[PDB]
Every structure is written in C-alpha cells, then in structure tokens.
Design an enzyme around this catalytic site. Structure first.
Site, mmCIF file in Angstrom:
data_model
loop_
_atom_site.group_PDB
_atom_site.id
_atom_site.type_symbol
_atom_site.label_atom_id
_atom_site.label_comp_id
_atom_site.label_asym_id
_atom_site.label_seq_id
_atom_site.Cartn_x
_atom_site.Cartn_y
_atom_site.Cartn_z
ATOM 1 N N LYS A 136 58.642 3.105 83.316
ATOM 2 C CA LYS A 136 58.391 3.646 85.149
ATOM 3 C C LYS A 136 56.839 4.671 84.412
ATOM 4 O O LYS A 136 57.324 5.406 84.448
ATOM 5 C CB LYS A 136 59.452 4.190 85.448
ATOM 6 N N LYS B 100 54.294 5.774 94.568
ATOM 7 C CA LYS B 100 54.712 5.825 95.646
ATOM 8 C C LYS B 100 53.861 5.756 96.511
ATOM 9 O O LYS B 100 53.646 6.948 97.664
ATOM 10 C CB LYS B 100 55.174 7.798 95.695
ATOM 11 N N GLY C 283 76.607 8.077 83.584
ATOM 12 C CA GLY C 283 77.991 7.425 84.782
ATOM 13 C C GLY C 283 77.906 7.433 86.316
ATOM 14 O O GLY C 283 78.874 6.451 86.435
ATOM 15 N N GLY D 141 71.192 14.502 87.363
ATOM 16 C CA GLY D 141 72.276 13.541 87.581
ATOM 17 C C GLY D 141 73.200 12.842 86.243
ATOM 18 O O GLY D 141 72.893 13.214 85.104
ATOM 19 N N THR E 51 44.995 0.215 103.112
ATOM 20 C CA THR E 51 44.397 1.119 102.072
ATOM 21 C C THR E 51 45.484 0.683 100.929
ATOM 22 O O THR E 51 45.430 0.364 99.853
ATOM 23 C CB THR E 51 44.325 2.238 102.118
ATOM 24 N N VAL F 87 68.515 11.992 86.862
ATOM 25 C CA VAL F 87 69.371 12.112 85.331
ATOM 26 C C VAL F 87 68.887 12.607 84.451
ATOM 27 O O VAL F 87 67.495 12.777 83.793
ATOM 28 C CB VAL F 87 69.567 10.360 85.011
ATOM 29 N N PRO G 60 66.746 8.070 90.249
ATOM 30 C CA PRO G 60 65.787 8.702 89.039
ATOM 31 C C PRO G 60 66.252 10.417 88.952
ATOM 32 O O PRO G 60 67.639 10.524 89.782
ATOM 33 C CB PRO G 60 64.514 8.544 89.221
ATOM 34 N N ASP H 101 54.542 3.678 89.753
ATOM 35 C CA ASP H 101 55.529 4.534 90.195
ATOM 36 C C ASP H 101 54.251 5.336 91.199
ATOM 37 O O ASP H 101 54.745 6.168 90.393
ATOM 38 C CB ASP H 101 56.459 5.334 89.726
ATOM 39 N N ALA I 250 67.275 16.000 83.334
ATOM 40 C CA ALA I 250 66.668 17.068 84.087
ATOM 41 C C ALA I 250 66.833 17.368 85.083
ATOM 42 O O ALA I 250 67.118 18.757 85.511
ATOM 43 C CB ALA I 250 64.806 16.910 83.827
HETATM 44 O O1 LIG Z 1 63.436 10.920 94.360
HETATM 45 C C1 LIG Z 1 63.081 10.725 92.984
HETATM 46 C C2 LIG Z 1 61.923 9.593 92.915
HETATM 47 C C3 LIG Z 1 61.621 9.676 91.904
HETATM 48 O O2 LIG Z 1 59.852 8.548 91.545
HETATM 49 N N1 LIG Z 1 61.394 10.690 91.084
HETATM 50 C C4 LIG Z 1 60.673 10.828 89.871
HETATM 51 O O3 LIG Z 1 60.913 10.244 88.766
HETATM 52 C C5 LIG Z 1 60.963 10.761 87.441
HETATM 53 C C6 LIG Z 1 62.315 12.180 87.022
HETATM 54 O O4 LIG Z 1 61.966 12.401 85.412
HETATM 55 P P1 LIG Z 1 62.958 13.276 84.909
HETATM 56 O O5 LIG Z 1 63.988 12.140 84.288
HETATM 57 O O6 LIG Z 1 62.248 14.164 83.834
HETATM 58 O O7 LIG Z 1 62.921 14.248 86.449
HETATM 59 C C7 LIG Z 1 59.694 11.620 87.586
HETATM 60 O O8 LIG Z 1 58.777 10.664 87.142
HETATM 61 C C8 LIG Z 1 59.905 11.847 89.408
HETATM 62 O O9 LIG Z 1 58.551 11.301 89.432
HETATM 63 C C9 LIG Z 1 62.186 11.072 90.679
HETATM 64 O O10 LIG Z 1 62.295 11.884 90.325
HETATM 65 N N2 LIG Z 1 62.716 11.612 92.105
HETATM 66 O O1 LIG Z 2 46.710 8.712 108.584
HETATM 67 C C1 LIG Z 2 45.626 8.186 108.117
HETATM 68 C C2 LIG Z 2 45.235 9.454 107.421
HETATM 69 C C3 LIG Z 2 44.301 8.842 106.334
HETATM 70 O O2 LIG Z 2 43.611 9.526 104.626
HETATM 71 N N1 LIG Z 2 43.362 7.332 106.225
HETATM 72 C C4 LIG Z 2 42.132 7.320 105.172
HETATM 73 O O3 LIG Z 2 41.299 7.494 105.501
HETATM 74 C C5 LIG Z 2 40.421 5.987 105.697
HETATM 75 C C6 LIG Z 2 40.367 5.666 106.608
HETATM 76 O O4 LIG Z 2 39.001 4.113 106.459
HETATM 77 P P1 LIG Z 2 38.397 3.611 108.111
HETATM 78 O O5 LIG Z 2 37.393 4.341 108.851
HETATM 79 O O6 LIG Z 2 37.741 2.524 107.509
HETATM 80 O O7 LIG Z 2 39.212 3.337 108.317
HETATM 81 C C7 LIG Z 2 41.217 5.340 104.724
HETATM 82 O O8 LIG Z 2 41.201 5.996 103.179
HETATM 83 C C8 LIG Z 2 42.702 5.782 104.707
HETATM 84 O O9 LIG Z 2 43.473 5.517 103.957
HETATM 85 C C9 LIG Z 2 43.950 6.376 107.201
HETATM 86 O O10 LIG Z 2 42.262 6.235 107.906
HETATM 87 N N2 LIG Z 2 44.794 7.456 108.396
#
Ligand SMILES: O=c1cc(O)n([C@@H]2O[C@H](COP(=O)(O)O)[C@@H](O)[C@H]2O)c(=O)[nH]1
Ligand SMILES: O=c1cc(O)n([C@@H]2O[C@H](COP(=O)(O)O)[C@@H](O)[C@H]2O)c(=O)[nH]1
EC number: 4.1.1.23
Lengths: 218, 219
Positions: free
Chosen positions: A37, A67, A185, A182, A74, A177, A175, A65, A179
């Site tokens: 990931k 999110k 097992g 979690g 977009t 687990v 995720p 990842d 740090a």
């Molecule tokens: O709910 C979530 C969703 C995630 O993607 N993550 C991601 O999973 C990873 C967890 O890393 P770590 O094992 O070092 O805590 C990070 O990349 C984090 O952004 C998380 O920890 N919790």
């Molecule tokens: O609620 C939101 C938050 C945003 O950042 N945006 C962002 O604002 C821009 C809108 O562009 P447009 O005027 O082409 O619709 C895009 O970059 C979009 O990701 C949105 O449209 N609505």
C-alpha cells in the site's frame, strides 16, 4: 465477484518518504509480501513514478491509498491518473456519497482495476462523524457492488459488524495493526488481510518484524 | 487577519498537463493572484508544478488535497505539501478534530494556512456530509481555524456556514459556473469564489474570467 489474493494475508503500508529508504525497506521484506500500500507521504515526496518502480522491482500489487474524497468529476480524474501510473487498486472514501464512489467505479471498470471502499477509520477522531455513518457507507458500497473494503483493526466489534454487512464473499483489509494497537490474529477473524506500516518499516530489523508478525498468525 | 485574494476570484486549475495548465493560467494571470491546484494536476505532473506556478505567476497557491487521513499521515501530507511551496492546504473535517489539529500543527510550524472543508457542492454531499456540516464548522471555529470552504451550490447552507464562522473568518466557495453556482449570489457570503472549467475550458479563458469579474464589479 472473485477477489484478489494477498500473500500471507499481510499488506505493507509503505509510508517512508524518501525513495532510497522506501525501496530498501521494501526489499528487506519482499519475501513475505506481494502487496504494498503506497500513499501520499511517499507519492507526494517522490512522484507517481514510484508506483511503476515498485511494480517492476518487486513484482507486487500496488494499492494506492489516496483516500479519494472529492466531487465525481475530480474523482474520475484522480482515478485515471492513478491507474495510468500503474496502480492495481485505489482506496476511496465513502463519506462524500454514492456519486463520488460511482465515479471511481466507472474508471476502475474501464481500466480493469479495483476500488476499495473506506467505510470506517482507526483513529480516535473517527468517532466524531465517520463512526455514525459507517454502517450506511458500507451498505452503500454493497448496494453498488463494491467488492473490496477497508475497516479498522482498532475497533474489533466495528470490524465484525462491517464483515456482517459486506458478507463472506467481499474482500476486507484492515489497518491499525501494530503501531495503533491492533492485534494481527484478532483482526484476521474478520479481515482477509492486515495492513502494517511503522511496526515493520521503523523496526530495527524490518524482516524480523514481518517474520514475527507472520509467525504469530501462521 | 486573513489573506486577501485579488478580485475575489480563485482559479481552480484542474487541467492535467503542464503545458495547457501553464498556458491557460498565463492567459488569465492579470485577473487573479491565487490559484487552487489539486490532485488532477499534481498527480499528472508532480509536486514541482507548485513551485513552477509560484515562480512564473507570483501567485498564492492553495493545495486542494482534501486531506482525509489519520493524524500521523495528515502531518506527513502537510509537510510534503508545504515543503513543495504551497501557501495553504485544504483539509476535510469529517475525519475529526485530531486529524485537523495534525494539519494545524504543521501549518503553524511552517508559517502556512489550513482551509477547513465543511460541506461539499455535489449531490452526494447530501448523504453524509450535509448532516455533519454545521458540527464540522463549529469544530473548526472551536480550534481557531480561520479559513473555510463551503458550497456555492447550496446558498442557504453557505449562509449558515457564514453565521457559524462569523464575519472575521475567511470563506471560499466552489461550484460556481460548471456546477451552477452564481458569482454574485455566492459573494454575499463568501470572501472569494473558486472557478474551474467555466474558465479553463472556455474557448477564450481570459474573456471568461473578465466576464465573471465584470458581473461582480459592483462587489
Ligand atoms: O483507518 C485507517 C485507514 C488507513 O488507510 N490507514 C492507513 O494505514 C497505515 C497505517 O500505518 P501504521 O501501521 O504505521 O499505523 C497508514 O498508511 C494510514 O494512513 C489507517 O491507519 N487507518
Ligand atoms: O465541494 C467542493 C469542494 C471542492 O474543492 N471542489 C473543487 O472545486 C473545483 C470546481 O471546479 P469547477 O468550477 O470546474 O466545477 C474542483 O477542483 C473541485 O474538486 C468542488 O467542486 N466542490
């Protein structure tokens, strides 16, 4: 439908932020894993080319990842860029709603890739807004035919509920687990694979850390 | 004290290749001093595009990365983004207060700004975001967040957001043009409007920007 197979049920969260360390540590644990990931910490530091680098050097599946949490138009652009860079799958937030999820599903279907729906998160702040929406977000995914889900190892009963909603045929990764506290097992009672970051990549010996984790779930 | 945005107009630069993005921005550079750059451009061309914009145009850059991770990861994203030269970053509030504070920590350290996204402009925002939006905004106010993003496509929601954050907070608003929001109506509540495709996909982007400013010359 049929879901992906993850070697040893273990996914490395590679959140180191320089290329040399990221490649070196991943190299150290390459025998234990076939799925990595990669998130924004590494990508924003080194560029999207890092994804193709991992696939070529390690022959691994890459889950981006990212999110994804924007408006539909977009989201489509983000997914297209990400899949063009070689990612096998992308993680998308469900909280922005069904149109935003469908936008990602559209691109994944076109390009032959996968979407993972993030339904609930592992950190304390998740309780404020995400937790109350999580069952409905999961059900929204199921209703749209999403096959792959992310849920928190730090909330085992929430993870259990998520598994009940998505059924036995869906794929669930988890995720938090190591740090975040979690347990490998216990998490695998419900998840198909666990995600582990810092407790491997910050270890004095990453290979020993990965090997120890696998030993505990063998 | 909050930032000033020239002409109350922020360009959303979501073109995905460097040449087009730079050229179109160049066409409208006289009308704007603040550009919002998101993942469509950054993932296509690299984070170096941020410094390129700042040097070529002398503009403020808002990184629209809708940061939405756990606190540890949010910190890393913010650090990478500010290291690349971004003046501000947009962060989702729905993951909660710890995740927002992680971003505020880095912004304070590096002398940059956080914008809290409280509510979104697309139809799906109704499902979960809308119901949390007032509380997300209040969470921001309670943490001293001074910059906010709210939707032009829901004017009464935008008005409510302004009531929550007060007159001293800074509010920017997308959804103007392509998504149906009106420039003048939005500026009753927002300090600046964000406009993307109705400028960057226009046959004549400078004329489009000029037309927008003409319609709000009064404000
Ligand atoms: O709910 C979530 C969703 C995630 O993607 N993550 C991601 O999973 C990873 C967890 O890393 P770590 O094992 O070092 O805590 C990070 O990349 C984090 O952004 C998380 O920890 N919790
Ligand atoms: O609620 C939101 C938050 C945003 O950042 N945006 C962002 O604002 C821009 C809108 O562009 P447009 O005027 O082409 O619709 C895009 O970059 C979009 O990701 C949105 O449209 N609505």
């Amino acid at each position: 439908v049929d879901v992906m197979d993850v070697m040893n049920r273990l996914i490395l969260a590679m959140d180191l932020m320089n290329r040399d360390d990221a490649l070196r540590v991943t190299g150290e644990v390459r025998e234990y894993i076939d799925t990595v990931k990669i998130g924004y910490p590494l990508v924003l530091s080194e560029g999207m080319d890092i994804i193709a680098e991992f696939r070529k050097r390690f022959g691994c599946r890459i889950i981006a990842d990212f999110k994804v949490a924007d408006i539909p138009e977009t989201n489509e652009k983000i997914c297209r860029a990400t899949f063009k860079a070689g990612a096998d799958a992308i993680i998308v937030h469900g909280f922005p709603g069904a149109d935003s999820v469908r936008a990602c599903l559209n691109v994944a279907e076109e390009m032959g890739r996968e979407v993972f729906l993030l339904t609930e998160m592992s950190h304390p702040g998740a309780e404020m807004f995400i937790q109350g929406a999580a069952d409905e977000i999961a059900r929204m995914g199921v209703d749209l035919g999403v096959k792959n889900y992310v849920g928190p190892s730090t909330a085992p009963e929430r993870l259990s509920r998520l598994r009940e909603i998505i059924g036995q045929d869906s794929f669930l990764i988890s995720p938090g687990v190591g740090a975040q506290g979690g347990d490998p097992g216990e998490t695998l009672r419900f998840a198909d694979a666990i995600i582990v970051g810092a407790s491997i990549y910050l270890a004095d010996n990453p290979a020993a850390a990965a090997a120890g984790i696998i030993e505990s779930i063998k």
